[PDB]
Design a protein around this ligand. Structure first.
Ligand code: SAH
Ligand code: NA
Ligand code: PT
Ligand code: PT
Lengths: 265, 265
């Protein structure tokens, strides 16, 4: 009868909510996708064991082109679950999926889970101060995306922080590191020369949020661009004018240079 | 003392994550606070029953002024859990708390949970398009705050959505409804004449996020300002120019007027 959008959380299979687990356990069919993000702390096997169901993993093409062709033949007889990393509707196009299903006569429910979008709070940066978000995409051939640079510019001018989701090619097992995003940004700066992202820009890196020991680091690009932040996933943040308490957190928790406390300079 | 910040999630006692529940059960002492927000879909008794541990509630004062005298000296040699609605560290007081503990030589870990910041994704509005967020506070005495109005203007001006939290008196359990928020915003519009919030402005109201049956409504102020959105807490969002996909989602899921497909896209 119905379709469940169930988020699995940030890091591992335990990041799912109790609500999500109890509902997943009782679904007749369980589908999942693992291309919108990376859950570096678990495996398909562990998730299957926790839920006690066999999980059919879908590729991006299966979902975007054949979702209703794969699910309709079931959702019309049985309860179906669709599992995704983090929160199913955050920084994905899965919301549009609910539209398809509804037009096809299948009602759906969403079960939220920890998302990187709110997890940024662990960096000490005021979540309300974040502005428009962007994604740093891998260049492809001659195509070199650069719009994320303009987003940073617009937010920074307003004194707002910029959350930069990093690119991922799940089928090639390529997960963009914060180091790589910084290299790409330095190159876009070299081209545009807007003084938006340079060696002296203060950035914040959050790696593997959701794990008990995520990597939280802050400092100037020149010092962090070659630093090892551990395995992916990574998220990069370009803060705006800092609040003193934001600077305190970055210094005391993220090991930032004590000089940022002079938010005046 | 190792301190575990554990988020309780959006609505009820099942919104905590499997990870949070298990860690909370392993902790010798479990504290909680419900002053930053309330868990409107459940009760302390129900959360206590699920966690299977005695839950010691702490007031805003207990936390901000005496946390080191209550939690620490109690949990000399043990692990302590501190339960908070939503996702820990989203609220500023939690981040400050972590800094304080670190200075006191106390290490802490964070177990994330769904936050309203990511949950709003259920409105169909793309998360990347949200800009600076703000809170609508009641005017009182000789004080009439209006900054939240400027936040809307700056965001919408750039085609960004504005997430608006509504005033809450946790201790007294009093909430500002979306209706009241709308009246206040119109009152501010009359004072500023910015053409930012009027009877023709498109807004979205979200209530009981986390619940399996949340209330998601979209429409013009003139139509929504007297609608019954149910029990608080409510969340008000003033979107910017809509993506056609966003608009279709609002029409088909949040019952928005077909009219938005040509007026707000
Ligand atoms: N646990 C994590 N730690 C650090 N970054 C993460 C992360 N999870 C996701 N990200 C970031 O977000 C990108 C995927 S976008 C999908 C986000 C997911 N829907 C959610 O709600 O969390 C990743 O490439 C990475 O840039
Ligand atoms: Na935001
Ligand atoms: Pt989208
Ligand atoms: Pt919250």
């Amino acid at each position: 009868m119905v379709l469940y959008f169930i988020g699995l959380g940030l890091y591992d299979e335990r990041d799912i909510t109790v609500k999500g687990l109890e509902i997943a356990k009782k679904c007749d069919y369980v589908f999942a996708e693992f291309y919108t993000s990376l859950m570096a702390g678990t495996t398909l096997g562990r998730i299957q064991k926790l839920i006690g169901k066999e999980i059919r993993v879908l590729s991006r093409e299966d979902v975007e082109l054949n979702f209703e062709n794969i699910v309709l033949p079931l959702a019309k007889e049985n309860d179906v679950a669709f599992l995704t990393p983090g929160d199913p509707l955050v920084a994905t196009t899965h919301a549009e999926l609910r539209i398809r299903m509804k037009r096809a006569g299948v009602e759906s429910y969403v079960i939220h889970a920890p998302s990187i979008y709110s997890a940024v709070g662990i960096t000490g940066l005021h979540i309300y101060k974040f502005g428009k978000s962007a994604t740093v995409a891998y260049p492809e051939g001659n195509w070199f995306p650069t719009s994320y640079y303009d987003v940073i510019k617009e937010n920074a001018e307003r004194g707002l922080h910029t959350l930069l989701f990093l690119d991922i090619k799940a089928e090639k097992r390529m997960y963009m590191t914060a180091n790589e995003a910084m290299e790409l940004l330095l190159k876009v700066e070299d081209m545009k020369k807007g003084g938006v992202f340079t060696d002296d820009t203060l950035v914040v890196v959050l790696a593997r949020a959701g794990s008990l020991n995520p990597t939280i680091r802050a400092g100037y690009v020149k010092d962090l661009i070659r630093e090892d932040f551990g395995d992916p996933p990574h998220i990069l943040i370009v803060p705006g004018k800092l609040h003193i308490v934001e600077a305190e957190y970055l210094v005391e928790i993220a090991g930032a240079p004590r000089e940022i406390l002079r938010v005046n300079v």
